[PDB]
Scaffold this active site. Structure first.
Site: not given
Lengths: 252, 67
Positions: A20, A22, A29, A31, A89, A105
């Site tokens: 996470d 970011d 997805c 990140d 995605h 993913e």
């Protein structure tokens, strides 16, 4: 640039973990893909935007965007991009053939925001991928990111509140997502502040380590503000590490 | 818990802001926070309910429902 071997080790090390970096809303997805591409380009490529925007980023000659075709063979370390939805995605490819490919993913099932869905290895029978981003990996392993000026501690002062700080005069431009600036101190417990908008910019004169974040300190309209600009692992000295940036730094 | 109005929402970028009814700080809203897979977009001026989560980037909306 890191090697394809290092790409494989990064993917497996992050299986079952939540990425996470970011800083926005759990394990999304993009990140994972932003973190992966930042790692394997040794910090040279910080991807901006949503998953479907990945193919329009500037890879600076360190990757090639290919379209998915019935004949295309994905490889370990490719980045699979789905562009035929609202936001797309994105996945980190582990292996593939003409019938299916496997990947790491996040948020395939929609559980990234609430946090129960971690980076997961899954098989896809070409159920939406439209593009593959192939890095131009080096042949040998690289430690350039971990020894760079960004991820070395350097010299800091500490104040009586435990905040590490140092002088640094530069300009920060906010990346894709907005960030809330805090009044008066680099503390998440400070409720006052304002939303720093994407592509907004400020000169700054201070950098701080506080509350798991790196911050910039600056003045605006006579008020002192602190804006977080990336994550910090909370450690000092040779254990110090900071995450990929939430904007772009410049000098004038 | 809280009610508010969507201040703006950029559907291309998938985020925007909500003005809470109690006049507190604007709250960031990301498309992944919107309840219901059929939505993933919000409209300017739309009435919403949501929970506030305080994150590293600032106050964010979660479980956003169109009322």
């Amino acid at each position: 640039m890191k090697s394809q071997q290092q790409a494989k080790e990064w993917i497996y090390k992050h299986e079952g973990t939540g990425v996470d970096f970011d800083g926005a809303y759990g394990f999304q997805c993009m990140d994972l893909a932003v973190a992966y591409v930042y790692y394997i380009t040794d910090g040279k490529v910080r991807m901006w935007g949503n998953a479907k925007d990945a193919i329009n980023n500037d890879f600076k000659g360190l990757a090639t965007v290919y379209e998915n075709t019935p004949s295309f063979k994905p490889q370990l370390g490719d980045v699979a991009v789905y562009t035929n939805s609202q936001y797309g995605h994105i996945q980190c490819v582990i292996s593939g053939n003409l019938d299916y490919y496997t990947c790491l993913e996040q948020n395939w099932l929609g559980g990234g925001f609430d946090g129960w869905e971690k980076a997961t290895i899954r098989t896809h029978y070409y159920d939406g991928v439209t593009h593959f981003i192939r890095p131009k990996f080096s042949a040998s392993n690289s430690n350039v990111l971990e020894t760079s000026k960004v991820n070395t501690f350097g010299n800091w002062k500490q104040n009586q509140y435990g905040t590490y700080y140092r002088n640094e005069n530069a300009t920060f431009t906010c990346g894709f997502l907005p960030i809330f600036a805090r009044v008066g101190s680099p503390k998440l417990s400070e409720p006052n502040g304002y939303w720093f908008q994407p592509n907004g910019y400020t000169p700054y004169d201070e950098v701080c380590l506080s509350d798991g974040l790196v911050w910039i300190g600056y003045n605006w309209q006579g008020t002192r503000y602190y804006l977080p600009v990336r994550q910090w692992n909370g450690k000092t000295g040779n254990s110090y590490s900071i995450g990929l940036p939430w904007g772009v730094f410049s000098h004038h | 818990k809280i009610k508010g109005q969507v201040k703006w929402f950029n559907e291309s970028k998938g985020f925007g802001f909500i003005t809470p009814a109690d006049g507190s700080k604007d709250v960031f809203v990301h498309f992944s926070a919107i309840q219901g897979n059929g939505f993933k977009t919000l409209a300017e001026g739309q009435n919403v309910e949501f929970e506030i989560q305080d994150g590293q980037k600032g106050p964010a909306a979660v479980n956003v429902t169109a009322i």
